[PDB]
Design a protein around this ligand. Sequence first.
Ligand SMILES: Cc1cc2nc3c(=O)[nH]c(=O)nc-3n(C[C@H](O)[C@H](O)[C@H](O)COP(=O)(O)OP(=O)(O)OC[C@H]3O[C@@H](n4cnc5c(N)ncnc54)[C@H](O)[C@@H]3O)c2cc1C
Length: 433
Amino acid sequence: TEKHFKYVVLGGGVAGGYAAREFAKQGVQPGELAIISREAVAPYERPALSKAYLFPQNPARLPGFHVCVGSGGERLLPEWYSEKGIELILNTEIVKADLASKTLTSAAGATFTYEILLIATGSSVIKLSDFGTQGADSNNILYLREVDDADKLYAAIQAKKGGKAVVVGGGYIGLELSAVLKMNNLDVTMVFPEPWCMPRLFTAEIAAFYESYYTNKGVKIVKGTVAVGFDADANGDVTAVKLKDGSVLEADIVVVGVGGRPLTTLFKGQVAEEKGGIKTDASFETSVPGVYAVGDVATFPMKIYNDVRRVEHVDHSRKSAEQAVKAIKGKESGEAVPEYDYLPYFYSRSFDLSWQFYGDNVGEAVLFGDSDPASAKPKFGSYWIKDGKVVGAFLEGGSGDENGLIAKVARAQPPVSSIEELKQDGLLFASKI
Ligand SMILES: Cc1cc2nc3c(=O)[nH]c(=O)nc-3n(C[C@H](O)[C@H](O)[C@H](O)COP(=O)(O)OP(=O)(O)OC[C@H]3O[C@@H](n4cnc5c(N)ncnc54)[C@H](O)[C@@H]3O)c2cc1C
């Protein structure tokens, strides 16, 4: 009929799951907390979907990558929630939220009320149909966001093995999926309009490592164009991808990753919005008191650069959720909570490659170490320098110890005397803060 909970988390993804963990840690009592989710499963570590979920043998499958294993904490199975009297309400989609009345409505008519609301609704894919691309509705043109998408992609990879796959996009989705499709032995061509891959993060030299490495694996890369059409066949299945530059690629499966948008749609006009997200303070509270927003949807004060930003980082989803739960319990008990202080951190893994990045990629980049893609065990990095201070750091193929160092460089923002003593001595510069 109508259920009330003191705390309601809306969205059962990374941040919802991590928030539930912090609620338990902070001494949440049975009956107080609900987590409302549109998916059929308990919170899971979404980055595995474009990685081990799609491996040729013994792909990762739930319940193995439920949160919080992805950061090495305990696995929250559905029975973890119910053991704590945390109500995990699955297969439920909120289609209406009314903040004044503190009321949420499901597609099927159930209503939920709350005292405190944690919005963790994440992001949705941008699709090529969004802007009328010809034949974009053809079957086997596929997007990847949730585990249900992952199963369909996996089923289509099985059907089309030994086929041709086109990947549209050069973001981390494009790169990761291009790799997995080549590991499943399809003939892969990657296509994107930007001039090199990962264009919001990589510099031209970084990108040239990855693009050469991919081409050596057999993944072709076409840059500076876009798909403007798709040919199909009688059952309605994609057969071809028509490029803007007149060219045409054979295709049995197309995987698209041209970015996303935060699902703020329920709250439009009800909270302040900024840079596409829901504006939060340093404790993740919105314009409306007792309503918080975390993970992809939140636009928050980035204290280290004295800026306001919105990010799409698994690590931020985890930390922002913890911060909001600590702020809510802080408000109840009077006790002071320190301002969110996030250091941006992104990572990816494709083929047998693995890189990290920390900080801000502004200013002049300088490479160090070894960029030859023909090394069996490639290792190299890059620092970004602004105002005689290193403000960002990247590393491909670091041990785990070294990743620790660059993170420290990124935080401390150490001066640069000599560029030369920095390029011979890339990882060795780090030690001298
Ligand atoms: C395939 C893939 C790979 C990724 N890889 C990486 C990576 O390698 N590194 C990295 O740092 N980041 C990665 N990201 C981003 C990361 O996965 C995080 O999940 C994301 O940044 C945000 O987590 P979140 O809790 O805000 O949103 P999500 O985890 O998307 O969760 C939002 C939840 O809310 C539910 N929901 C939304 N609207 C409603 C509604 N109206 N009613 C009910 N439920 C609703 C959604 O279905 C979902 O379950 C990746 C993302 C994807 C999709």
